[PDB]
Amino acid sequence: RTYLYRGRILNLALEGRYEIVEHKPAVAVIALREGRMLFVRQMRPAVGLAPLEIPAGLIEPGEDPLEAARRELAEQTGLSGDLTYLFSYFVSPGFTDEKTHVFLAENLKEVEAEAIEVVWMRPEEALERHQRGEVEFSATGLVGVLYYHAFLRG
Amino acid sequence: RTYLYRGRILNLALEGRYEIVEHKPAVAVIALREGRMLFVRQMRPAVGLAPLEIPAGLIEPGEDPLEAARRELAEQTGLSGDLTYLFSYFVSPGFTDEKTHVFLAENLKEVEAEAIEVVWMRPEEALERHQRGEVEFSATGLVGVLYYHAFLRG
Ligand SMILES: Nc1ncnc2c1ncn2[C@@H]1O[C@H](COP(=O)(O)OP(=O)(O)OC[C@H]2O[C@@H](O)[C@H](O)[C@@H]2O)[C@@H](O)[C@H]1O
Numbered sequence: 547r548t549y550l551y552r553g554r555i556l557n558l559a560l561e562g563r564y565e566i567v568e569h570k571p572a573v574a575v576i577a578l579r580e581g582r583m584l585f586v587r588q589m590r591p592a593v594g595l596a597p598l599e600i601p602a603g604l605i606e607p608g609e610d611p612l613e614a615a616r617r618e619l620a621e622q623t624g625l626s627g628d629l630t631y632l633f634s635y636f637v638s639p640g641f642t643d644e645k646t647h648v649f650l651a652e653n654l655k656e657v658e659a660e661a662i663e664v665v666w667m668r669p670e671e672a673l674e675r676h677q678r679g680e681v682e683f684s685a686t687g688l689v690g691v692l693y694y695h696a697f698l699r700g
Numbered sequence: 701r702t703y704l705y706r707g708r709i710l711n712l713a714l715e716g717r718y719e720i721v722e723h724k725p726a727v728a729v730i731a732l733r734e735g736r737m738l739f740v741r742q743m744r745p746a747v748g749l750a751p752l753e754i755p756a757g758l759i760e761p762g763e764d765p766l767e768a769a770r771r772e773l774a775e776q777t778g779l780s781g782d783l784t785y786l787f788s789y790f791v792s793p794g795f796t797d798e799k800t801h802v803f804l805a806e807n808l809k810e811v812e813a814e815a816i817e818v819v820w821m822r823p824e825e826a827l828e829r830h831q832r833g834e835v836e837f838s839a840t841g842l843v844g845v846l847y848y849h850a851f852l853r854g
């Protein structure tokens with residue numbers, strides 16, 4: 547594997563004819579309260595718009611998935627809760643090694659008090675808005691919506 | 701936006717301090733038959749292993765999402781069916797613009813007869829195997845599993 551670029555959050559490598567983008571692993575937090583899911587939005591230069599996501603971020607040096615999940619939740623929404631590991635997935639294995647660890651957060655409590663918009667919204671509404679072409683989803687946002695519909699109803 | 705590299709399936713650009721990887725849009729197909737979901741596996745150099753995915757691929761020039769979905773399904777599994785658009789998501793909006801359009805396939809029929817392994821498996825089994833640390837998920841594979849659990853049971 548030869549490297550053509552070593553950047554901040556990614557390295558561009560070449561493994562034969564395969565173009566490979568190395569990327570730090572990430573975490574995402576699914577949190578439901580009073581029927582609303584905790585989404586977040588921020589301008590994403592890579593896509594030119596603000597998709598609907600759930601609290602997510604990169605795992606920092608010395609951090610394990612659970613600790614990163616806790617930090618991301620607090621820094622982006624000012625909340626903390628009881629976290630449970632759910633599952634993980636490679637965002638796009640065809641070209642990048644970015645792996646995302648998803649957690650569920652319960653018993654949320656505000657521990658703290660601008661570039662990231664906190665968007666509490668019923669998953670049913672996020673889905674319909676998306677179906678209407680009004681809002682876009684990040685993989686984390688869609689996973690949160692589907693997860694809710696499958697195991698958090700009732 | 702300045703470009704540091706223009707490759708086969710991706711371009712590495714720089715927009716200010718933001719590192720941006722341009723990538724063609726993709727499609728993914730969710731198909732269920734007799735309680736089993738249609739997964740596929742192939743060695744992915746980017747991650748060094750074969751994660752559980754669902755039929756997916758890049759949209760080619762002149763192709764729209766639906767046509768790409770049809771082509772991918774046939775080329776990877778030799779099947780065709782009635783496709784319905786479900787939703788879309790950006791795989792990792794924090795650095796790439798890759799957008800994936802997900803479809804549901806029904807009334808599958810074999811129209812055709814080696815690098816891609818066709819893996820028919822009950823979503824419940826894929827989830828438990830993953831939870832056991834035996835198999836990894838691509839975002840498409842996880843989305844398929846969650847989608848099934850939320851709307852295809854019974
Ligand atoms: N990192 C890569 N760099 C260059 N060429 C690649 C790479 N990965 C695959 N290819 C080439 O592209 C062809 C595959 O085309 P597709 O039809 O798009 O199918 P596939 O790549 O297997 O799945 C595509 C989509 O699913 C996700 O897992 C993946 O992230 C991608 O967005 C193959 O013949 C292969 O030679």
Ligand SMILES: Nc1ncnc2c1ncn2[C@@H]1O[C@H](COP(=O)(O)OP(=O)(O)OC[C@H]2O[C@@H](O)[C@H](O)[C@@H]2O)[C@@H](O)[C@H]1O
Pocket residue numbers: 554555572592599602603604684717718719720791792793794795
């Ligand atoms: N393309 C980029 N290139 C360089 N730096 C970036 C980029 N995108 C964001 N950053 C920097 O990284 C910091 C964000 O760190 P994180 O805690 O990781 O949170 P965030 O990037 O907002 O979400 C991370 C994860 O969610 C997905 O949407 C995204 O694909 C990523 O895997 C910000 O302060 C910002 O300056």
Ligand SMILES: [Mg+2]
Pocket residue numbers: 603604605618
């Ligand atoms: Mg972070």
Ligand SMILES: [Mg+2]
Pocket residue numbers: 757758759772
């Ligand atoms: Mg293709």
